[PDB]
């Protein structure tokens, strides 16, 4: 009597030890659960910011993808520590001792996440997806289904990550333009400006201590 | 998705692109011609002498005719993204 | 002959599971422990060899591994292992960054400058420097220190329902800035010399526009860069000693700071 | 019910424990099953359009394949909430605790999918595959088989996805051409136009607020 | 049905557990049987042609490997409905209710596959492998063994797939060369031609109805 | 799939490509040549002066010769995809 | 026949698994022997040569890994069919109906494999491993232990596969170098030579009838 | 009745056991060295994992043959016909393994595991238990396998760098150096017949 | 497989590659040099004026000496693949 | 396996890499300089004029200095394999 296995007698004492349909869904989608879980968190914005920073430094794939995937994970774990804490003290703390029921526990585990997503989603995206869904007034946050909130959240995170990335490009774009113009004004047409500009970009990024500023901005602008 | 629709869409795109680049390219060409003419009087063989006035002229054109180009691009992209559901037949 | 009853078979499975998971979390993301050259069977075998010594003299927090408690405990275990391993990834990320920045100035990967499309990077020099860093890591027994630090994490914060403090995670994410800083500090001489060489090539372009970077600069710049990297190697040994040591101190401080705020 | 492990007595009280051929089929499908099940959904067109957009931005793999994978899944879940609910109430609910057999449980879960893919399939593809299969009139939805409906639907989705992607490239192509022309007219020949054009492309994409425009256009065009 | 584990009670509440050679060959063949079945189901030619098309588009992994793989299976399933249902009515139907043993069911279901692979296989490959096998007088098609039929069929499918891919490569190569020559003539010698050729490639591919023509060709050129 | 047939397909493709790119390349060449001649006669020279007339000429040529080139490409690709099942072997 | 397991419950909710050493080594070997049997056969050379060819085509993973694995299996089955049927008539036939012992059937099933390896094993590898093992004269083929035959055979197969692959790369390397040099002469430093080389590589590989030649060479390289 | 499914789960779990025996053998070093070589050739998964695993198993069987013979004559043959107890035959099956481990195990790993195992002073090497010797041996094998792999891994990257520099100096910025370096790398590896030298080096360095 | 065999095979391969590339590179260099001499005699400073003549010359060289290079390369590959099961032992 | 041993191994590796690439890189640099100076003496000037001579010079250098570089590589690899057992601690 395994949780995933269902047994039914057939014919002459034959028991069909078969796999439950829920277990089938899980075993089909196990390679997808990391994707959805990472999209419901702040991963979607940190990763785009990090990638756009890589492109801004004029040095694609300069830090390996794995180290930045780990770094973005740390920011998600720190940023949503209040969310998980709420989940712990509202869902697991009253349930670990079988003090409250299963059905309400998923709602209690989703309400902090629902509010957290709502605090980031633009009103325009929610209105657009509600109009496409032909839903009702949705005056209250509880009235907003996951069907509308999930795509609106990601389409807002993409926009804000792109905006932050563009703000990141702006200084490096100025650096590249200045270096190229200085080279061209001195009759150095053949010399590619990227080779000269790359060390200057890295030095200016390090001297202004840009990584600390990026962490501060990503931590600050996200909850507000 | 008839070829005539593709050609009309490409014509509109090329018209928008020309509207974008006509001021910048025109002012760069005019400034370069003016400096090349002036170089005849001075007999200067400084090859990239026209680069700085070209840059300042392009910057002036951008800071003067910038919002117009931005509005044109925003309107054109908005129309494309609005009629995306209709182009498929 | 060989006899294996139920109690022994299960107790062994349940007792080992949580230290096993933490150790595998460390192994699957780690300087040398996480390599596709190492097969996953070896990855699990080393983890369970480590669990063979972790399990004794360890509190028996034996909860069912098919409940939500299992998910919560697994989350904390994976968090600890991932934190340790990815924090120690910083030294090798820094040396790879320094090597690839040196190579880009040399001109090895110029296709990346002109277009991001296509996998035409192949930072060979960065790979060589990353090898040297890993070999120095082996000679300094860095993996042994990682295992000892994991044991210390087991001791200080046991397998339990106490949430891990997140200020440490933010601090070690903020410490991610060491990559570029150490990349510069390792690559300042070659970068400056190649910048001066490129400026000299531009000055040569001044007198003759027919001289081009493709025609003249790239062969000479590549030769000079190869000579400099041949000459820059002896600097690698003390730099790696400093680099691993500072990251180890940072990890020790962060681990000591985690369990106060559970 | 489901396919699983069967135990059949043999001879003198001897019991044989072996898997079922349907279980072997189930495992062999699992290797590619997820893909075939997900292409009957909206995943194909959305993921192709997103990949084409990522190529259009001039910065390949700036959003990683995992983020695009999560985003396509979120948009598909938003689009096919009614289909998923119909499958749930018609197939999943009456079969989770076995009020119905597996053979007609797939038929119940396929009829909404069949009708939907009929809605989203061009008549030209259906006619092409009917002629290739040398089938009959196929006047009714009941007449057209799955064998003809699946590849025709896939071809229709691929054609629509490339149409949308080609329309997407146009503004970015204009941006690239304009910036390259300006850089050449300034004498800035050796400067790579991609480095200067990527931040401008992102700035245009965030001012136009194209992300929600893309989601709305995809939803409206795919509901038709 | 399939070989598995056998159990005979012994003494007081004792359960023996043994297996035969069929079980040990079957468990090892589990890993390789999907690959062999894919080899005999012409998945190779379709997947290779589609990968070559993906390379010809100049945008690697613009449709992910999963969607390309799934559409290849869908096209193969459309192609081999007669083979599949012939196998069903000849092999699976008389074996599901254990009317025939597996040893004859395998060769009964492989007869339509044998006739198929004989139809698609070229005569040259068959002659080459017949002389490599140093066989005697082989006249009748039934006398052709599977050991000769399989590799010759694989070679024929590989050659046909490569020919089809080579022919597909031509218009995209023409577009790439034309745009590269135009860019070089205008002097824009730092602009990557791919970023301009990809939108034009997709414009051509949606204006010629590339997917319809490609699917129709892959179907019609296949029963021949 | 004889080498003669491959050469025939290659020369057909080469003819299609030549007719596809002949207008743009010839117009760009003519514009560059005439602008360079004018610069030589005027004894003033800016290398990027000729880029704008070249772009304008190519832009005009695409408008004038666009439909014909598109029709050529569409017809040739249709012929290829129709003959594919007959040229497999 | 094969060894097994005995299980008797102990008190309430208990079970005991009695096991010998033969059954334990049999259970442990089940996850390894599918690879071992492919190591005794010609799989290694064929699969390595085909992977090297896949890399040579300039389009890695254009045929999926399962495609190469299945076609390599088919080629090995064609090559090893006499050994396979000799094993069948000498080992599997007299052991399927328990007419002869397992310890001796294993000896019978290895004799044709040993003869095959000795046919393809170079004398240099045998001498190297005999020197490393401090063995005796080993003048006769029967005097050669399996511990000497296996690694020497594997080393010879690896060396032969690498030789064949290196010979295969040469025409494709010539095509790539010629196309790159022509492009550089024409300028076009932005044009990737792969997009031109791949269609020309397919042109060559279908005009020279490359697949038949490669298969024939691989098959004839084993009888020698 | 659930006991008949518990035994099947036990068998499934036992299928994972042979990892331990591969740790006790040369597998952990050989497979890592061969994976490093696969990364060296610039063509990942050119020989499939099955091929690499099988050839590693064959190399280990060649190397570990005397140890297997000692175990056979000491543990398997007196226990197959039930002449000796299992608990003590297991001990008999480790002493050759003990002497085999102690030769390839570095002092640093043993010291670290003794310090972190809270074990007391040991008077003799035979007093070292398996629970402490096995992880130290695995770590030492990891270290030496990576050292061997990186020592062999040099010339291929030297070829990569040389070819990339030459191609770049020829102005061939868009040509990918890997596709030209792979044939040259294989040419060198065949010319110096590096398979034989690699096999011999692994065997001798693991014997010593 | 002795190093002498590798050297002779490599030199033969280089001979084939040179025969493939000698006409195209030769005609490209010749037309580029001729256009350069024209650029020097008359004070024409156009940069990409030689590109179109080089493309035309390479096109003509491929059209004329096409079947010869194709046959040479095919014969070389046939010989290599026929000697494959013999050069290895 | 002392750190100094790894450091010396890296220095030797880079020395071998330099000895492999110095001939070809220096030959390419020399021929590029020669072509550029010849262009400077005359009035001819385009980017691609020196590429073909650079290719030819590198090809000739590869032919001439091929056996020597191959012997260096083979000796280095053989010494590495021979000293592999000695470097293991």
Residue numbers in the entry:
A (entry chain E), D (entry chain D), E (entry chain C), G (entry chain B): 22 to 245
B (entry chain J), F (entry chain I), I (entry chain H), J (entry chain G): 1 to 89
C (entry chain F): 1 to 262
H (entry chain A): 38 to 245
Tell me, in the authors' exact words, what the paper reports:
The FliPQR complex forms a channel for export of flagellar structural subunits. It also acts as a template for FliE assembly within the Membrane-supramembrane-ring. Five FliP subunits and one FliR subunit assemble into a right-handed helical structure with a narrow central pore. Four FliQ subunits peripherally associate on the outside of the FliP5–FliR1 complex.
To address this issue, we conducted cryoelectron microscopy (cryoEM) structural analysis of the purified Salmonella FliPQR complex reconstituted in a peptidisc, which is a sheet of short amphipathic bihelical peptides, and obtained the structure of the completely closed form at 3.0 Å resolution. After iterative 3D refinement with C1 symmetry, the 3D image of the FliPQR complex was reconstructed at 3.0 Å resolution from 109,333 particles (EMDB ID: EMD-61993). In agreement with previous reports, the FliPQR complex adopts a right-handed helical structure composed of 5 FliP subunits, 4 FliQ subunits, and 1 FliR subunit. The densities corresponding to residues 22 to 41 of four mature FliP subunits, FliP2, FliP3, FliP4, and FliP5, and residues 1 to 5 of FliR are clearly visible, enabling us to build the atomic model of these N-terminal regions. The N-terminal region of the four FliP subunits whose N termini are resolved forms a β-hairpin with β-strands β1 and β2. The N-terminal region of FliR contains a single β-strand (β1). These β-strands form a β-sheet at the tip of the FliPQR complex, which we named the β-cap. A total of six tryptophan residues, five Trp-38 of FliP and Trp-9 of FliR, stabilize the β-cap structure via hydrophobic contacts with each other. Furthermore, the N-terminal α-helix (α1) of FliP1 projects toward the export channel, and its N-terminal region, including Trp-38, inserts into the cavity of the β-cap, thereby maintaining the closed state of the periplasmic gate. The β-cap has a narrow pore between FliP5 and FliR that is wide enough to allow the passage of a single α-helix (Left).
